[PDB]
From Swiss-Prot:
Post-translational events: Glycosylated.
Name the UniProt record assigns to this protein: Very low-density lipoprotein receptor
Organism, scientific name: Homo sapiens
Cellular localisation: Cell membrane; Membrane, Clathrin-coated pit
Disulfide bonds: C1-C13, C8-C26, C20-C37
Length: 37
């Protein structure tokens, strides 16, 4: 992934925009965990 793109634990490149967005973009769903949002 590029230097400006966040990496999920599986290697998926997801923009920095899509944190706590409501959408399970990362396969493990760690970015969308309710406790950390
Ligand atoms: Ca997401």
């Amino acid at each position: 992934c590029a230097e400006s793109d966040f990496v999920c634990n599986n290697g998926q490149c997801v923009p920095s925009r899509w944190k706590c967005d409501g959408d399970p973009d990362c396969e493990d769903g760690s970015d969308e965990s309710p406790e950390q949002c």
